[PDB]
Design a protein around this ligand. Sequence first.
Ligand code: NI
Length: 341
Amino acid sequence: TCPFYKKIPGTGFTVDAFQYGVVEGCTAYFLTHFHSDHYAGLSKHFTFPVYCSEITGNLLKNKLHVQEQYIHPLPLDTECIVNGVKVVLLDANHCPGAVMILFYLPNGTVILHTGDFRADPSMERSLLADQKVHMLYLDTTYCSPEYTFPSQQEVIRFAINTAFEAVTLNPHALVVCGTYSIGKEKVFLAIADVLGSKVGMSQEKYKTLQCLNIPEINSLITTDMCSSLVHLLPMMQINFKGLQSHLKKCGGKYNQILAFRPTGWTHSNKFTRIADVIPQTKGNISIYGIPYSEHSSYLEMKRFVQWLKPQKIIPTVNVGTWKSRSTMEKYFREWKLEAGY
Ligand code: NI
């Protein structure tokens, strides 16, 4: 049955609550983004209204076959009215089409649901600047101080320089990038752009990326693996057996793979700067784990909350153990004491 932290009080709304059947007294189902832990349970047989971004709606229609009459896409940064409640969708800086949702309840309470997000100081200049928030439903994925990571831009610089150098030294090398859900597209697109190649992939992955409004996508992606020197594969195939196998299938077109696994965090970041990262190598296969995160680091999260100064924080991640919950509540107290609210 539905957890309390997926329910918006004083409304008939839920957020990312599609694996519970018919939720008692839910009139409208919001979806923050197209990742499987959040959409789990949608299908062509779903007949309640779903509210979401334009991109997420494209994906519901095309990938899950949800019927068009039940998809209610909203533009960003725009006051809209749902079942008599004013709502706004804000960019979450997560994956394509991911949003945070602002709710303005009839009694004057204001609620922000972050969905999944990576906090950034650019958010301190949206419709959030203009008013107070009583309740924050917060993405606490990395809510512990050991989670530090570089900026996405520093990680992309590292990957582009690495791939450029490798292929210049060996023009018969193949670059591989692992993927398991939408998100992290800049990794593979930036690499392809510096090598003057398209990114090759399965027809199903190509179809998924065409659902996204990426300007000049016919331009960056293809299903012709032959013409391409950057290939996308399932994250699971990013290991030595998977990559030897793939290398065989290219029919002596390539003699080496350099592969990137853009993971969230790895305990190497406690003892290593981005500049000092190295691969795992076996034969003519090298694998780099790079800390490209689409969630807030601990310090990014803390700054965002100390700026917003919500009256109450409800964590939405890591809530299933008493020790995790207590640890997060202790941080939230420090933040409030340090910030003076
Ligand atoms: Ni997500």
